[PDB]
Amino acid sequence: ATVAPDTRSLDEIYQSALKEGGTVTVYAGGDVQSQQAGFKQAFENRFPGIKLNVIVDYSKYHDARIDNQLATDTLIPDVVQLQTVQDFPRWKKQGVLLNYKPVGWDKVYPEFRDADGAWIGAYVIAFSNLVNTQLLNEKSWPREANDYLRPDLKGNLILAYPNDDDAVLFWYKQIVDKYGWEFVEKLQEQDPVYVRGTNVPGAQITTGKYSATFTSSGALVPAAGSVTRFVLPKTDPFVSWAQRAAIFKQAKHPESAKLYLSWLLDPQTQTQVSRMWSVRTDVAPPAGYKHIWEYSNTRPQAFADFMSDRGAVERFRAQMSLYVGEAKGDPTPGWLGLHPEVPLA
Amino acid sequence: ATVAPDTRSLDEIYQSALKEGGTVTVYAGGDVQSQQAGFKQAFENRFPGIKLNVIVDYSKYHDARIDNQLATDTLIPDVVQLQTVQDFPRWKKQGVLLNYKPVGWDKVYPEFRDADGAWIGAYVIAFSNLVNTQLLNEKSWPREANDYLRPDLKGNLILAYPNDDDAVLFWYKQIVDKYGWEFVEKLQEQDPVYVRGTNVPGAQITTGKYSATFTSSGALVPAAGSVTRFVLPKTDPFVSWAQRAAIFKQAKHPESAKLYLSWLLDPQTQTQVSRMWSVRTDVAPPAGYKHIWEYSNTRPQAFADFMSDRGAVERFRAQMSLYVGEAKGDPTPGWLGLHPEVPLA
Ligand SMILES: [Fe+3]
Ligand SMILES: [Fe+3]
């Protein structure tokens, strides 16, 4: 189907969605269910009568889960949203995605949406420096990769496993490109603590157990009283991308899915719920920042290009494994199995 | 450089190799060091004064290891020998392999050798049924995949993790192609015990802890008094391939490396040391068997084709992981790190 952007108001879509039973099911990529709590609360407050049944798991498990459900005709979710961005052109070509251009589609940065409406970039995520501002004064915030190699940061770093998350991995890819394998060798001499779940480094830095990490997302607008700060490099690369979302052709609740995607693109959602950059050209960067496509030291398309060559990703991942070891510990979302219909209890 | 098969006798190559210091270092794919003990013993007994410094690790770790050593100019081994067969044309194209047609090159089945001498099929491995013949009479040996679903085998199977070894994985790929995902579903209801290391199921079947496994190698001619038997299906597919070996262009001991490759193809090695099929057309299979390329229910090239598409391999691996869980336990070869120069202590 050839479609035009939805011309309905959010409330008009909501009236249609209400007739579908009161729930929309989203398989969302992430580390822990709480990372989507803010979206769920905001959505459900905005739309009484419709539950956002968002279920969080690592994107590399959700995409497999979806492929298997499609193979076995047991598809559960209405919507998929993941950082494994290469899946979306593949699912599109497979014919399993509903072409839908949500409200505001015309204002999305072209790179951040499919031309036919098969998928949409929902919001921007970036991985870079997160520092404890009480442990480190501003003049000593590590911002470039090699700052993390200075003597006083030995034993004070906590890092997400790069062999457990390809967005984390891509940070290392860009840095090895620039500084060589020697960076990775010297980094290990800092006795970093590696953990699964990209939420965990920020959590432990917040409680003052570690001082900094260079592969974390975070609020561009810190809360008053915050003891952490997301800080971009002055010159070194950082990782960024638009999290991709799509509606399945055979979704049981298509209008509820449309409501969800249109709500995600709404300027208020983009500025007050999403905590980093917007995918829209008519939404102002938070004061002090530029649009994500205006930074010379990141390139969201580069992450997409990276993710499209699985052999190249695999070969780089396995080499990183030899430096950091196998990814220890349980997966942070818990084990959802083949057919989760609700979040883990 | 265009080369012809080595026209020297083994003894001639051996005289040259003796001048190089008495060691040849081989990075060999495998689950545990003891799997190469037979080769090591036979080689060193045939060529006093030359040590086969064969170092065993999972192929998926050795190839990354080699890539990183190449990238950092820290290459250690003279010879690489792995099941990750797709690595060999890539290393060929990178220019890091020494073109060398060993003695007997002309008699290697064409599919099992590089046209230029960049690599050679060293010996044939197959994964299929291994049964305990004391626990199970012949009429009840499971041979077909669906035999393993019978009631009395519940709690009585031990299986290599398919998400820890791609040759193990390919067995499942072929069986899902034929029987669908339902086989994998029903298999989990049999409560199989999964383990890392393809040696481990056999080891535990041999002591009578389990009755059978369907992804193991084994002797085509069982030893006198054996309590296990390697048995092919009557009709279902099984996995087979020629393990590939190559000499590095910058091998420190090239004549010793050539001795090793020529020794691999020597009739005595192909008939008395290698325990499954030979890569040579002029080596008769044991009675009861045909050449590995004459079975309609296996195809060595299908495994090579499989392994060449890393994205397809990844997507199938991740789905299998949803059924069997993450691969638990330590890696069976131990942790060798970036630069092993000798086997682990
Ligand atoms: Fe990922
Ligand atoms: Fe493998």
Numbering used by the authors:
A (entry chain A), B (entry chain C): 28 to 372
How does the study describe this entry?
In this study we show that IbpS, a protein secreted by D. dadantii, can bind Fe3+ and Cu2+. We demonstrate that exogenously added IbpS reduces the toxicity of H2O2, probably by preventing the Fenton reaction. Our work establishes that members of the Ibp family exhibit the same fold as SBP proteins albeit with significant modifications making of IbpS structure a prototype for this family. The reduced pathogenicities of D. dadantii ibpS and Botrytis cinerea ibp mutants reveal the importance of this conserved protein in the infectious process deployed by necrotrophic microbes probably because of their impaired capacity to detoxify ROS produced during infection.
In the case of iron, the protein was co-crystallized with FeCl3 and the structure of iron bound IbpS was solved at a resolution of 1.8 Å. The protein crystalized in a different crystal form with the P1 space group and four molecules per asymmetric unit. All four molecules were bound to a single-iron atom at the same binding site. The structures of IbpS and Fe-IbpS were nearly identical and no important structural modification was observed. As suspected from our previous analysis, the metal did not bind at the canonical SBP cluster D protein substrate-binding pocket. Instead, the iron atom was located near the dimer interface, at the entry of tunnel identified previously. The metal sits in a cavity formed by residues S86, K87, Q110, T111, M334, and a triple aspartate motif of the α5-β8 loop (D191, D192, D193) and containing a dense network of water molecules. Nevertheless, the conservation of the residues involved in iron-binding in IbpS strongly suggests that the binding site identified here accomplishes a common, essential function in all members of this family.
